Design a protein around this ligand. Structure first.
Ligand SMILES: CCCC(=O)Nc1cccnc1Cl
Length: 460
């Protein structure tokens, strides 16, 4: 029974509006409705993993698990196994997997982050799950961010708090936040970013939606504009949106957007918006392809419509050789030539690097770099040919070329990371000097760059 090199993952996000779901929600899991939808010929083919995020979820965990599992069993005739379930207030994540995957899944972590302070602490935040699927680390975040058209900056702040404080994945990756801990990270939820057009334009927006003309609306979508200005979700991907705004509907139909200010909305307008989103970030040169991204049309208990996204994701096997795990394989090495970090910091400490990778027995600390001044004000930290030779556990190129090296540049004075990034070992050649590059971030914001050359020796 061979190990897979690809799986498919279903991501759902649905703000349930504190109402129980209708009796049938199968269209969600089938990726049917509006947008990039799944072919009918696939309807009986189960996804490998289903990850369901809800917000304003009024159900108990038990109640929702019974609906989800019976939904999937009706579609696929498979009884899915529960990998994890975690709830913060009314924000919930469920991970279900095909039974054949039970002994491929391990290291399951759950966590939550509560956003805001005093006033603004008590219903927004995020839940998440991570696990290993054979050799591949997977992370999933369902966030319910701050509401209201004039709170995009708060949403951006919520995002940074969640990625700083959500404690998922391998705790030994201490310099790295969730945006670096996983082969594949999926972040979804009621992100609550709005279409930023004047209130007076509400009926014009509705007209555009009825004509399926989204271009002039998407050009004002706050998540797309904040991401283009590098204010949020730096280095994440999102499929093109080709479905109608998923908020705010009159319940029990989809024929009406309810946008006008009401006491129940705090006298705020809710112009039609793409509140409900799925984004991802995968390590460089790992296969990930979005195969659906859309909304359902026939689930109408909430003022939001459910959103679905599906992905092909590359996975790797739990590799064993005669040498590693449990020792190094002297026929493998990773060398760095002519490396330097360019940092945005105004500070003047010495810096050193740490290399972290599950291809190493443990992380590797470099010597301190040599600081120089860049021509446009920058700090340049030069490592030259001084970086330690990395000793992978396994030399087989079928393993090593699928690996990644995480890099943190740390202050000698504080041991605090000033920047994190990731280098793929999926090189064009071995035993050949090749350019490498990663942006460096800290708390998910850009702080610099790391570039140089790599020379990878495998057993071939
Ligand atoms: C609800 C948690 C039950 C559980 O232990 N799930 C699990 C763990 C490891 C691998 N696969 C699965 Cl389904």
């Amino acid at each position: 029974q061979p190990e897979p090199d690809m799986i498919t993952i279903f991501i759902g996000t649905w703000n349930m509006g504190n109402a129980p779901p209708p009796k049938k929600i199968t269209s969600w899991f089938l990726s049917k409705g509006q947008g990039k939808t799944r072919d009918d010929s696939a309807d009986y083919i189960p996804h490998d993993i289903y990850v369901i995020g809800t917000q304003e979820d009024p159900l108990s965990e038990k109640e929702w698990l019974e609906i989800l599992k019976h939904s999937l069993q009706e579609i696929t005739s498979v009884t899915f196994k529960t990998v994890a379930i975690h709830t913060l207030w009314n924000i919930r994540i469920v991970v279900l997997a095909k039974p054949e995957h039970e002994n491929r899944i391990s290291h399951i972590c759950t966590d939550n982050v509560k956003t805001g302070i005093a006033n603004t602490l008590g219903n927004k935040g995020a839940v998440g799950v991570s696990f290993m699927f054979n050799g591949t680390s997977l992370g999933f975040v369902n966030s319910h961010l701050t509401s209201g058209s004039e709170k995009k900056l708060r949403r951006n702040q919520n995002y940074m708090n969640i990625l700083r404080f959500l404690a998922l994945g391998d705790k030994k990756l201490s310099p790295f936040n969730i945006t670096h801990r996983f082969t594949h990270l999926f972040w979804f939820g009621d992100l609550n970013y709005r279409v930023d057009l004047p209130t007076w334009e509400a009926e014009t927006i509705i007209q555009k939606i009825k004509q399926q003309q989204y271009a002039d609306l998407l050009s004002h979508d706050q998540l797309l504009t904040e991401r283009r200005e590098q204010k949020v979700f730096l280095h994440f991907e999102e499929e093109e949106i080709t479905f109608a705004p998923t908020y705010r509907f009159e319940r029990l139909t989809r024929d009406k957007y309810a946008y006008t200010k009401q006491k129940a909305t705090g006298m705020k307008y809710n112009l039609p918006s793409w509140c409900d989103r799925v984004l991802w970030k995968s390590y460089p040169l790992v296969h990930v392809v979005c195969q659906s991204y859309g909304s359902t049309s026939d689930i109408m208990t909430s003022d939001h419509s459910p959103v679905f996204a599906t992905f092909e994701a590359g996975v790797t096997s739990q590799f064993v050789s005669k040498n590693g795990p449990g020792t190094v394989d002297s026929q493998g090495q990773i060398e760095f030539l002519r490396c330097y970090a360019t940092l945005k910091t105004k500070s003047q400490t010495k810096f050193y690097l740490e290399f972290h990778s599950s291809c190493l027995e443990s992380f590797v600390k470099s010597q301190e770099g040599e600081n120089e001044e860049g021509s446009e004000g920058e700090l340049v930290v030069k490592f030259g040919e001084t970086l330690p030779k990395l000793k992978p556990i396994i030399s087989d190129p079928e393993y090593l070329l699928d690996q990644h090296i995480l890099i943190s540049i740390k202050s000698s004075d504080s041991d605090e990371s000033y920047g994190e990034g990731c280098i793929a070992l999926r090189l064009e050649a071995t035993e050949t000097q090749l350019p490498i590059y990663t942006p460096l971030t800290h708390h998910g914001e850009l702080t610099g760059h790391f570039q140089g050359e790599i020379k990878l020796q495998t057993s071939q």
